[PDB]
């Protein structure tokens, strides 16, 4: 019996198979197992609140109409030309927190299709979906976001279709590297959400929750240390003699303006949000410190019209600005560790 006869008598319009009818029609529901594989992860764009993942979506169920009889022993499993996946029954499945999802067809539809003796099926299909995870940026450069991926079903209720994760090792990912964030292979929390859309009924859903712990490297290097240098330069401004009146105001002025420009840059690199970000806290604090240096020079000038008062002002400033700045830095790090 050639293999064409096998595939035909198994699944095709030439045999008594109907794909438009799920298995166990008007009977027991379907228990769909699932298991993901993260091949690529990144391209996170906080401005659009999305992250791109290229994965292999594996889903195995049982379809009694597919039953390799004992008449032949070629294998307990069986692999088939991917072009048959469109013939037999496929379960409705969509990622709900999705914005753009495209297959990956190159030289063939990137699709697997295994079959077993008792009827178990297994289909894997490459995907590159651009999900969406609403970010919490109350503490941006040290945030711990939880970007999720909640599978669902659209044309089948919870009374006919049913998703469940793989018992052991549902998600997999090897040698994963992100520039900014760092995934935790252990914090891979997954659970049910069982969406209930009004007007239709109860629909199933199973969610993965990747815990992304951003690191403070690039930000510490690009926004923190420069502002720290600016503020210590504002401090330095004090050691000058007040008799100048033109060699001490420019330091504070340009410090203020550079901090404002840094704020503009950071706001243009990130999304517009109502709440405040710890980075903006630090930056406005440094800005107020520069402004304080400037008003200190001002108070000196007013006291200049006198020498003892000016010396007292300048010394108290040189001794107060660094101590207060250091206390602020201490509390800031101890709060936003």
């Amino acid at each position: 019996v050639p293999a064409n006869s096998t595939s035909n008598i198994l699944n095709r319009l030439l045999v008594s198979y109907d794909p438009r009818i799920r298995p166990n029609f008007k009977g027991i529901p379907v228990d769909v197992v699932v298991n993901i594989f993260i091949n690529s992860f990144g391209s996170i764009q906080e401005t659009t609140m999305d992250y791109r993942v290229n994965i292999f979506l594996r889903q195995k169920w049982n379809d009694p109409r597919l039953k390799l009889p004992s008449d032949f022993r070629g294998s307990d499993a069986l692999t088939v030309d991917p072009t048959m996946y469109k013939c037999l029954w496929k379960p409705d499945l969509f990622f709900a927190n999705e914005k753009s999802a495209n297959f990956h067809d190159v030289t063939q539809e990137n699709i697997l299709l295994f079959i077993f003796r008792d009827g178990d099926v297994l289909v894997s299909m490459r995907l590159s979906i651009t999900l969406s995870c609403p970010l919490d940026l109350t503490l941006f450069p040290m945030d711990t976001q939880r970007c999720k991926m909640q599978l669902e079903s659209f044309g089948y209720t919870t009374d006919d279709l049913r998703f469940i994760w793989q018992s052991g090792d549902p998600v997999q990912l090897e040698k994963i590297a992100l520039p900014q964030f760092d995934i935790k292979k252990e914090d891979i929390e997954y659970g049910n959400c069982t969406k209930y859309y009004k007007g239709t009924g109860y629909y199933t859903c199973v969610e993965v929750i990747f815990t992304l712990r951003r690191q403070v490297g690039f930000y510490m290097m690009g926004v923190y240390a420069p502002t720290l240098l600016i503020v210590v330069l504002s401090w330095l401004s004090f050691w000058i003699n007040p008799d100048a009146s033109a060699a001490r105001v420019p330091l504070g002025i340009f410090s203020v303006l550079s901090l404002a420009s840094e704020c503009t840059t950071l706001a243009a690199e990130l999304p517009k949000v109502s709440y405040v970000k710890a980075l903006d806290v630090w930056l406005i604090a440094c800005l107020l410190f520069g402004f304080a240096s400037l008003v200190e020079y001002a108070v000196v000038q007013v006291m200049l019209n006198i020498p003892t008062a000016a010396k007292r002002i300048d010394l108290y400033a040189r001794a107060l600005f660094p101590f207060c700045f250091l206390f602020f830095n201490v509390i800031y790090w101890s709060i936003y560790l």
Binding site: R20, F95, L127, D160, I253, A260, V273
Partner: protein, 338 residues
Amino acid sequence: LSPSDFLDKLMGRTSGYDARIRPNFKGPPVNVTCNIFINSFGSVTETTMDYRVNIFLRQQWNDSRLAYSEYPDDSLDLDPSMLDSIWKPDLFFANEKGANFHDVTTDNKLLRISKNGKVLYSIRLTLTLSCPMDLKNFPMDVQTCTMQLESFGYTMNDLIFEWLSDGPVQVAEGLTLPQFILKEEKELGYCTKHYNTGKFTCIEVKFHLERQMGYYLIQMYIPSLLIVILSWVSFWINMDAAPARVALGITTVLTMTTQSSGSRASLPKVSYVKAIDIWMAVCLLFVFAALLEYAAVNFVSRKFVDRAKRIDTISRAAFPLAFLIFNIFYWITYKIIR
């Protein structure tokens, strides 16, 4: 009888159903009750004047040719692939710029059928709808971005839309928006467009979006305030220190101009003034007038220096007062009025 034979007899090739013909041909029109379930709202770019959504567009109606008696199950769900073989009402979003389905593991749809023939056709979508904006009151804007459902092929004599009686529009528990604050009050009315071809039906829903001022405040209102306060502190300095006050006013004007340019550029090129531009321009004028005050001081000085000190004191006492009354005017008439 058999499910496959049942389908083939009801709507398949051997059934006798013609999808190209609306129910009740040459008869009363078809009443389509449409309702949506928003799932992801955002990407409101004022540059393009659009907002991208993602909805489970649902369309119910009643066609008598889909009544059965073999299956007592009232609500019968079917395979989306069978949808292409029945009738579907023409439908589009007039205010759309770019639309698309979402086909992943299947072409996302739903086909539910009742015993009386009542159909339900739930489909997924993603629409970059367009809503022209009024930015006269820009940071406090209350915009009404629409969603105009509408037919293209069938006239209002053969196809009539109408919102669902109760729960026509839903939102997902847990939704949130970065820049705006969606409301629960969503107007629902008829637009009933009328072209030269005929009278086409239409369904429009309007969301009242109220922008929140956190970002714009912390990014533009506070820094420019600091700039004008710099131009203020330039007063108390003595008069003989020309470069100090001069360079200070200069840099204040320059940073004000930079900030205003950035603000105006982040949004589309519009003629009518924007409150943010009012603020930028008036702060620029405040610092420019402070520099002009210093210049008048230097001109009057060279006991004219006593008059110069008097001018400096009068300015240090009046600038904050005028700036405060203007701040009042601005906030009171851009928050309490609008």
